[PDB]
Write a protein that binds this DNA or RNA. Structure first.
Lengths: 345, 251, 217, 121, 121
RNA sequence: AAUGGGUAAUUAUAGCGAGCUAGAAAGC
RNA sequence: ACGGAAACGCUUUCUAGCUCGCUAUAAUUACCCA
């Protein structure tokens, strides 16, 4: 048969956070111990409204009282002595090191972004996330797919053409569609005991410091092998999937000589397999054709938080060190570093 | 198998034969030309046309001139030959009578084994509707497909119908379905159907094989030219020309 | 003689599917690409057209020698099962598919399921200026199962052509375990498992004891 | 205001009054407005017009309320559809519906707009 | 309150009533409220609008009961969101949800607010 | 330097929108 | 002692056949404010 299957096994060096759109707020979790409890807040409200206490809950939510210890809905339940914790939702244990602040102030996390999930209650990694990470490798390592794929100044000129890849029905022409012929399937959904909720940590050049950010996305625990399939249907696509194991290294070599250099070696990790940069935290130089988006990306940021010159910030996190998967102290990962190996089946 | 299995009946008639015999010649001059010799000569000329020479015009055709002469002609026959025989009879009676003495046919299309009294009366009603259309008309097939002989023969039967046959018998994509939807849009006909046809023809223009597209482009610009001409005289010609074409290509 | 038999397969979903439908009154910030669902039960259907016209292309790249370029060009190993409409003797089907209604609307509520579809958020990262373009495509969830009935006709035009055709029905029903079953496809959305391929006759009398062995192979 | 003699002519000389693309001389004198940003507005009124025959008007007056939501929202996203509803006066054809035959008249107005948009490139 | 034949207009002149920057003449009449917080308001109600298509009111009224507290909390974060829920009567309209056919109407009111925000600046 | 919090942007984009066969036959 | 009396424009007939709602698409980007 023409359908030459594959088997991708992926590995988490740095934590990976993927989409889900929604996020909890400062008053949507419980923190009784090393577990953060994330309940179904509709059912929390439905149990708590029985005491006629919800009007008190109307006062607590707009209450910008200081000393964040008493702002995070644990003090609401430690105050009005609601003592069940029998609500729905999921409850994940702590990263243990994303609370740079003083002990017992700790637990004052603010805005947590959910991981993508299917409806049974487990998480997974979508096939479309891996497929969009694969497409950047295949677009930045094929040297015919970097030069003319730009704006040509049609509108205000920021936009790409998006036609330089075989795309579409295209009247009269035989059906080409290279990326129809690369069919990445979804991952086998794992369990919530590999999620740690890292905090974002920005490590800039020209002010050599690691100022953290108040954005605490959920993520994947490091050293987790994840199953995937790439079942092609054209031998032209079979060439690209066979050369993934070399094009990933070539992409990383044209990356590390370009952006990871001018940032010190201790913040960088090793590879141990072939390298890939999965979504949400890797920055806009793994989501882009970066060798042509150096002068077009920085035009968009004419706002209060412009990029510092070009190639402005490197994104790190804080996870438990599991190995040693680092090469430095204080556990600064890369937030999106992952490593895969491929094989025909 | 290129025909519908019908048979047509034409009852022709000279318009104003009585006005051609009472006054007749006194229009030219001061009442000095309506005389006895010219009257007898015109009468022998018209009987010589409508009794002898109808056999020459209907020599090869597959019809049967049941009754003919004076003015009135009543001819059954196969339908392509009936229509071509009316065309030849008018195109030889204006050659005979110099463009004077317009005649008025009315053709009716009938299935097989219908009686030839239910046939003859419906054709007579068609024919008097043609005479009441104007002084000269041919009423093809129905009480709404009324034309003029000056316009049915040139525009409908030889200009439009040969253009539709020249277009359709060159290609192998558009079949009977496109013609049926075209007649449906020509028959329903509000103003909004001009926009629906402008969408339909432009949609089908780029649906074709892209090599021979300008065949369809010069057809569709022409069809939209005689849909939206806004004279009411170039639309019914297209509807009846497509009726005659779907009749000709019916298996 | 005239018989008619029936395949009671069960399409189990694996990383479930999204058969699209178009709605002009959807929302602003909600679903803009919904699964096609039943109007009165609001369960997602796998309609029979997306099964039939998927198996048609699967077996049309396989059971053809001449490159087809159209239906009404298949090599009559297909067209006596799926019907042409330009061949004279093969206008009717001989295969009657069905809509696959969702069976386990209650073995799904046994698990922690609060809606039988799941809405996936799916941005489009512009490879220059890095900007997104979100969407919300709806899809039916993983552990669904769908009662898939397929009906095969038998007249006295099948001199020796009955048991040949189950090398076409089993070929399609384990090439759909290779293909995606309509959906985004190259982003997941397809993989399925035709459990319990269990043929049985429902009109006429016919021996299917010889038939149930080339289905469990 | 649009009545039964003019709502196709209004659509014709409202598509013609629209402005053309300056650059892109491959297929030049073409429109800014892509076909999708207009088919995704006729998609609403077509499923209205197929429902206006079945249903009474006074059970179909939430969908017509959503019409003025969606036309305003598609206008505020790109300048092309904003120019469309300012040229072909679609908002001032949406305050004035109030009964069934006018709702079908507005649906046929939208259809005439799409038809003459497909006709002229 | 809001019925089917007024909620767009009720949502129209609300955004005409929203305050603007009195200072800062850079795209003047720029609001104090931005598009992101209004979308973060609408994202509370979108899932409810889908579950009012699929499910019933009875398995849903607890989600509606929490949605009021969601709007309460989003009011207490920013002064412009504290005012948008007062110009457009949102908390006045959340008290009156008695049906599927009122919840869908409230979600169309939220979408009308977002549409008329996007149309204006 | 700590302490409070996140803020801005996109909310789907470009297509296709039905095609072909049949257009009434056989009788009284 | 009604150009009248008696007389179903009636029987038979599938809107039918064929056709994937599909193609591309990482819920992500920027770095801070009081």
């Amino acid at each position: 048969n023409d359908y030459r299957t594959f088997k991708l096994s992926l590995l988490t060096l740095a934590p990976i956070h993927i989409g889900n759109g929604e996020k909890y707020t400062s008053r949507e979790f419980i923190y009784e111990n090393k577990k953060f409890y994330f309940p179904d807040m509709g059912k929390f409200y439905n149990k708590m409204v029985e005491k006629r206490l919800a009007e008190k809950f109307e006062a607590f939510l707009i209450q910008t009282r200081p000393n964040a210890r008493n702002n995070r809905l644990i003090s609401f339940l430690n105050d009005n002595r609601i003592a069940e914790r029998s609500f729905g939702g999921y409850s994940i244990s702590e990263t243990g090191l994303e609370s740079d602040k003083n002990p017992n102030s700790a637990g004052a996390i603010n805005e947590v972004n959910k991981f993508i999930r299917d409806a049974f209650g487990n998480p997974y990694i979508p096939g479309s996330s891996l497929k969009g990470a694969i497409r950047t490798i295949l677009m930045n390592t094929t040297p015919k797919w970097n030069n003319e794929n730009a704006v040509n100044d049609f509108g205000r000129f920021p936009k790409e053409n998006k036609n330089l890849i075989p795309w579409g029905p295209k009247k009269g022409k035989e059906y080409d569609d290279l990326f129809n012929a690369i069919r990445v399937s979804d991952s086998k959904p794992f369990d919530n005991k590999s999620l740690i909720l890292v905090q974002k940590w920005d490590y800039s050049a020209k002010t050599n410091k690691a100022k953290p950010l108040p954005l605490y996305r959920e993520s994947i625990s490091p050293l987790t092998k994840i199953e995937f399939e790439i079942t092609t249907t054209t031998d032209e696509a079979g060439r690209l999937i066979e050369e993934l194991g070399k094009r990933a290294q070539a992409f990383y070599k044209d990356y590390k000589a370009f952006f990871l250099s001018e940032f010190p070696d201790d913040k960088i990790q090793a590879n141990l397999q072939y390298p890939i940069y999965l979504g949400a935290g890797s920055g806009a130089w793994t989501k882009t054709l970066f060798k042509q988006a150096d002068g077009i990306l920085q035009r968009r940021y004419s706002r209060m938080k412009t990029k510092m010159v070009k190639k402005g910030v490197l994104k790190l996190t804080k996870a438990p060190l599991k190995t040693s998967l680092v090469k430095n102290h204080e556990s600064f990962y890369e937030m999106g570093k992952a490593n895969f190996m491929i094989k025909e089946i | 198998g290129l025909g519908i299995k019908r048979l047509a009946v034409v009852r022709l008639d000279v318009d104003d034969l009585g006005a051609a015999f009472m006054a007749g010649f006194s229009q030219q001059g001061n009442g000095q030309y309506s005389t006895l010799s010219r009257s007898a000569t015109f009468s022998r000329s018209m009987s010589l046309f409508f009794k002898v020479y109808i056999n020459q015009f209907a020599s090869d055709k597959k019809l049967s001139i049941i009754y003919a002469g004076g003015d009135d002609v009543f001819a059954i026959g196969s339908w392509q030959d009936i229509i071509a025989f009316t065309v030849e009879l008018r195109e030889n009676f204006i050659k005979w009578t110099n463009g004077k003495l317009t005649l008025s046919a009315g053709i009716g299309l009938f299935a097989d084994k219908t009686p030839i009294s239910l046939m003859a009366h419906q054709t007579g009603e068609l024919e008097e509707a043609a005479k009441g259309n104007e002084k000269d008309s041919i009423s093809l097939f129905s009480s709404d497909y009324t034309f003029k002989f000056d316009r049915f023969i040139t525009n409908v039967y030889d200009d439009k119908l040969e253009q539709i046959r020249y277009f359709f018998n060159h290609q192998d994509e558009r079949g009977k379905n496109f013609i049926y939807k075209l007649i449906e849009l020509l028959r329903n006909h509000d103003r909004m159907n001009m926009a629906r046809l402008a969408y339909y023809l432009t949609r089908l223009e780029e649906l074709t094989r892209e090599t021979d597209r300008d065949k369809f482009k010069t057809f569709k610009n022409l069809f939209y030219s005689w849909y939206t001409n806004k004279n009411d005289k170039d639309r019914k010609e297209a509807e009846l020309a497509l009726l005659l074409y779907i009749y000709e290509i019916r298996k | 003689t005239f018989a008619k038999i029936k395949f009671s397969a069960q399409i189990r979903l694996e990383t479930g599917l999204h058969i699209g439908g178009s709605d002009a009154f959807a929302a602003i910030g909600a679903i803009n690409s919904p699964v096609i669902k039943d109007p009165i039960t609001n369960l997602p259907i796998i309609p029979g057209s997306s099964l039939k016209g998927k198996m048609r292309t699967l077996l049309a790249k396989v059971y053809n020698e001449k490159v087809a370029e159209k239906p009404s060009d298949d090599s009559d190993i297909l067209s006596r099962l799926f019907g042409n409409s330009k061949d004279k003797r093969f206008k009717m089907g001989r295969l009657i598919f069905r809509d696959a209604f969702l069976s386990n609307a209650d073995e799904l509520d046994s698990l922690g399921v609060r809606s039988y579809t799941e809405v996936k958020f799916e941005n489009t990262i512009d490879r220059i200026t890095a900007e997104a373009n979100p969407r919300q495509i709806e899809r039916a969830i993983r552990n669904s199962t769908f009662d898939f009935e397929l009906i095969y006709e038998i007249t006295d035009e099948n001199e020796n052509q009955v048991e040949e055709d189950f090398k076409v029905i089993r070929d399609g029903l384990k090439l759909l375990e290779l293909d995606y079953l309509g959906g985004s496809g190259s982003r997941g959305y397809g993989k399925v498992a035709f459990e319990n391929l269990k043929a049985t006759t429902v009109f006429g009398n016919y021996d299917v004891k010889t038939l149930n062995e080339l289905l469990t192979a | 205001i649009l009545t039964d003699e003019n709502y196709v002519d209004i659509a014709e000389k409202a598509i013609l009054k629209l402005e053309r693309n300056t650059r892109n001389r491959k297929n030049p004198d073409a429109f800014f407005l892509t076909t999708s940003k207009l088919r995704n507005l006729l998609s609403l009124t077509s499923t209205l017009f197929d429902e206006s025959k079945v249903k009474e008007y006074d059970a179909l007056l939430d969908r017509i309320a959503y019409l003025r939501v969606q036309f305003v929202y598609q206008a505020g996203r790109e300048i092309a559809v904003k120019d469309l509803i300012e040229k072909a006066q679609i908002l001032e054809a949406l305050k004035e519906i109030k009964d069934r035959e006018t709702l079908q008249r507005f649906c046929r107005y939208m259809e005439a707009l799409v038809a003459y948009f497909k006709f002229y490139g």
